[PDB]
Amino acid sequence: TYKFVNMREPSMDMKSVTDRAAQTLLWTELVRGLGMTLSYLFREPATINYPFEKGPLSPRFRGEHALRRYPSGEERCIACKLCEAVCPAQAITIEAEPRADGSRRTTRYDIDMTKCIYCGFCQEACPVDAIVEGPNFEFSTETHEELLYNKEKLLNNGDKWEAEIAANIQADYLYR
Amino acid sequence: GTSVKPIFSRDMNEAKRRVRELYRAWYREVPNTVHLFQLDISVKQGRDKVREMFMKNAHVTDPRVVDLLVIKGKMELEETINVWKQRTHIMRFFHETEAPRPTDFLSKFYVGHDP
Amino acid sequence: TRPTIRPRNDVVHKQLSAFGQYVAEILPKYVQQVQVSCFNELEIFIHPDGVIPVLTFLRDHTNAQFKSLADLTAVDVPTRQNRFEIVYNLLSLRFNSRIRVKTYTDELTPIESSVTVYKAANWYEREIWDMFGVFFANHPDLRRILTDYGFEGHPFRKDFPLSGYVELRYDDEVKRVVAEPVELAQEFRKFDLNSPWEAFPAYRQPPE
Amino acid sequence: LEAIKDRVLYVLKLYDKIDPEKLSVNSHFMKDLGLDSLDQVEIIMAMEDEFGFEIPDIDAEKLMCPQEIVDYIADKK
Amino acid sequence: LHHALIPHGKGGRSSVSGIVATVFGATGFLGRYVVNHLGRMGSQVIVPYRCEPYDTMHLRPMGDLGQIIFMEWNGKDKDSIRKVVEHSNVVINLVGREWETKNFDFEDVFVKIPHAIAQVSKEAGVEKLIHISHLNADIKSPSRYLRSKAVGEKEVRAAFPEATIIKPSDIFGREDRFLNYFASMRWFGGVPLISLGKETVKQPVYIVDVSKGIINAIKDPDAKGKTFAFVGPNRYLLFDLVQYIFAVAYRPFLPYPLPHFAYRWVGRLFEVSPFEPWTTRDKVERVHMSDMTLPHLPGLEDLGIQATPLELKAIEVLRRHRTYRWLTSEMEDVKPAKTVN
Amino acid sequence: SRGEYVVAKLDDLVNWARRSSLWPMTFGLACCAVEMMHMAAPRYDMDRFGVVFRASPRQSDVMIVAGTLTNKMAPALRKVYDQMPEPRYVVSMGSCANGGGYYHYSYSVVRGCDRIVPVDIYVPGCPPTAEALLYGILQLQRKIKREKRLRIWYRR
Amino acid sequence: LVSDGSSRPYRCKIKAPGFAHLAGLDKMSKGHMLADVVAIIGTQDIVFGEVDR
């Protein structure tokens, strides 16, 4: 079905003609606009007092990346390069070798945060929940190089935000 | 196909005629390009660059390729006349910020693995 | 029922096949081939010099009122003698249908401009020229539309590198932006993702 | 026509690739002077600069000698 | 060589040139040009600065990621000098003021600081040291600037015997002093000249040529302990040079002779400015002084650079000084000045 | 010292006005510009901080390079940055403006606006939230506070 | 979308509605002024991400 947005015609009776003439001479719709603006003036603003008040977020939020650990302290990543393969922007670089104890562990794990699109495919493709996109988003830097993370920086982020990341994963892991 | 569809100009004589017409159009435009863009080059330098750009395709012996080249040359000229370009592109024609690339075998051997 | 399998539409398939036969009978001079894909999309492969007559017929004929030019693009296949494949997608509002018309051309062969049939062909053919190097004969204003001013090469060709040949930066010595040969801090990493096991028996080709 | 001749010779002598010592009213551009198509085109454009009138391309190709140039200009006044 | 210092690439922005250069006084005219050339080549550049970090902003886009490093330094701090020259195999010295502030004088900027940089660089094991001096550096020169230049050159050679000492004549460019100083005399009515500028001969050198020579001296293996003189291809009288400058700027030229003592007093008046002075007595002395001729010293042709004549790059500097009436006038519109060769 | 005290207080006074009176240029590219609009929206009102958009680059103090910078656009961005008078600051927003973003290996994309203009602040995201950009603006303000121009001049 | 049987699309042409509208902008601005052109652009509702791709 369909409907007409502008197809009406005004009645030409004397009362309607005089009403339209009064609206033309006495700016009735302009006064209506003024009244609406005044109403909004007397309403309460929606502005939050940042940074003392923070906007709402969800456990699924994608923020700064992190590399997690098992509760024993061992790194979760097994150098399977699934995140590197699935990364749309090719922002992940991985190089691995057998560790001193023979574990399959990375020696280089770099993420370029100026190349990443924060799409979250890396945490979807991880079969051990090693790489995650944490909740932090206030990590703006004064220099370009500070946004070229490596394994040490990502492990530091994981250790720094482990509690919140673990809580969010517990809250949202039944939808995954 | 033996009977290739001609863009225009048929044989190479009309293609050469179009080449000369485009060369005249470019030649009469260099003073205006220098004046409007406020280039620091000489008018002689601009004419020499137009001549060089024309001469780098002097080995073409196909009328269709020549017609496409003159079409693209007219496109480039109409970009310059309407000041659609900036001084950036006009100077990009000159490669003013490149180091002189070595061309002798010994220098190429010294600098790197480039053939 | 099969919940995971898209249902077929035999009615639409038959209607499209009948209309393809109709147009092939009407225009034998240009129509080289007619196909109907199994998801009900009609395709017509015509000779390149029949673009104007075929489009005019499909636009003005009472039984084929394809008033709207939905799309116009090209596909580059280097392994063919005529690499470029010009594709026209047309929409018929009166009969609530869509059609596709495909022609072929190479680097040096012009394709007649279809701006006298549809006006959107102006910018669509400008984009085709800018991105593939296909020249359209009677174009009112044929010039680059998307690439940079003075850009060399046609980016969407299969043989044009992903990062191109030049890159831009601001040079303080000359107080202007300059274009210099491309040089990447990290090279794009080429992945070989194809599995060596055949996926679809239905599309197997004769070994020849 | 002597005025036209001296004007044409003055234009020719200003061209860098033209050798004034071997330059003469009968010197051919392609053979005697060893020029090419673009040099002749530039000479024709310079001639248009001096006399201030249009030279068609088909006419421009029939001006391979200074004598031919002055004859063409005289016929065109 | 260390495996990290082996050149790689095609000499682009993202290549490795094997040069780690600490560029003192990089926050300047010649400094910015040299840093730009190094970064374009693809070298590691350390920029010791004492000014506000805001004034070092233009040097950031001059190199790829991690190639430009900014480290705060103090001129009279050997600890800071060692910190900034610890890991660089080339050290370039371009520090110099044309006036004397309360804390730094010509002795400080041209003798003490260059000597400290040379001595600390020798201890740190820096392979190459380029030191910039002035062509007219005379021990008995009337100018304190040039006297300090000569003394500091001797001190630098004593401290670092394997140095390359470069003596540009008069650098002219966009952010220069020379052409701008001569073209900024419009505001003071006419142009005061000592002896009407008839007794002074100068051959200015192009800034890009100076920077290219400095870069080539680094890559030249047999320029270790040498002294180069960088001068332009043409020598002009001061009157002819200023006349050409005003002709290119399309400003009326009204020169007049001013006696030397009166000009010195005028310079004394202008140097009371706490900010950057417009002119000083030393500047007047240098302008009046004729550029020396040093045939024995090598030059740009010896380093592989063809000197760019003034008549080609004068319009880059002097077009800014024109008005809207003559903004679009072409380079060829002004005849070249009368040279003295 | 009296002079050092005077110049320190004067520098604090000057830096306060520039810190609290930021006038970004009305300049947005691609998707990242929508987050600037949501920052200007009532929820995260930028105007309350002293951040007011102005159209002319002459009357602008900050350029927010928000979105992808292409080769065809780089000369215009450089031109407007040059026409913006000093003191001037640059905040790059999003992966495209920071580095290459989703289009790093593209023939028609500049891998970082810092190849063209000196960048003071980098805001990471795709797109960074309005909160993230507001944090970047506050960080830029704090960076302005630490400038000591009169103190550099006095000890020069 | 054109697929050649592999896991990566062979061809992907994107038809954005704003491309044709912006192409037709010139005709809609006949006999109008600068403010009218501003209004016409607004009513065409152009997003240049989809226009350019």
Ligand SMILES: CCCCCCCCCCCCCCCCC[C@@H](O)O[C@H](CO[C@H](O)CCCCCCCCCCCCCCC)COP(=O)(O)OCC[N+](C)(C)C
């Ligand atoms: C006519 C000539 C010009 C007149 C200029 C003088 C008249 C104006 C006097 C100065 C105006 C007020 C300046 C002081 C502003 C105080 C506001 C207060 O909030 O600022 C605090 C302190 O102000 C500054 O930090 C100190 C510098 C400003 C005062 C400078 C010292 C006095 C200078 C001389 C004043 C008199 C001028 C005499 C010479 C003309 C910290 O603010 P800040 O941390 O940022 O904000 C963070 C965001 N928060 C609030 C949510 C947390």
Ligand SMILES: NC(=O)C1=CN([C@@H]2O[C@H](COP(=O)(O)OP(=O)(O)OC[C@H]3O[C@@H](n4cnc5c(N)ncnc54)[C@H](OP(=O)(O)O)[C@@H]3O)[C@@H](O)[C@H]2O)C=CC1
């Ligand atoms: N320019 C010319 O015409 C000629 C110059 N030269 C010499 O070339 C060199 C470069 O000259 P130029 O670039 O034109 O001059 P500038 O004044 O423009 O540059 C001087 C540089 O040295 C720094 N500097 C000055 N004083 C000090 C100090 N006390 N402590 C630390 N750093 C300091 C400046 O930094 P900041 O911003 O902090 O002051 C700036 O980076 C100088 O040595 C000069 O004598 C030689 C011949 C001709």
Ligand SMILES: *P(=O)(O)OCC(C)(C)[C@H](O)C(=O)NCCC(=O)NCCSC(=O)CCCCCCCCCCCCC
């Ligand atoms: P004579 O006829 O013997 O010689 C004619 C020439 C020299 C052209 C050849 O011998 C010739 O005819 N060759 C045949 C092939 C051919 O047609 N070559 C010419 C190709 S047309 C061409 O290449 C046009 C290029 C476009 C122009 C470039 C524009 C550059 C402008 C720069 C301006 C600088 C800023 C001011």
Ligand code: SF4
């Ligand atoms: S969020 Fe997406 S773009 Fe970013 S690193 Fe993960 S897979 Fe790559």
Ligand code: SF4
């Ligand atoms: S997907 Fe997970 S386990 Fe695999 S390489 Fe990436 S971070 Fe490591």
Ligand code: SF4
């Ligand atoms: S960084 Fe992401 S959101 Fe921002 S312009 Fe690029 S693609 Fe768009």
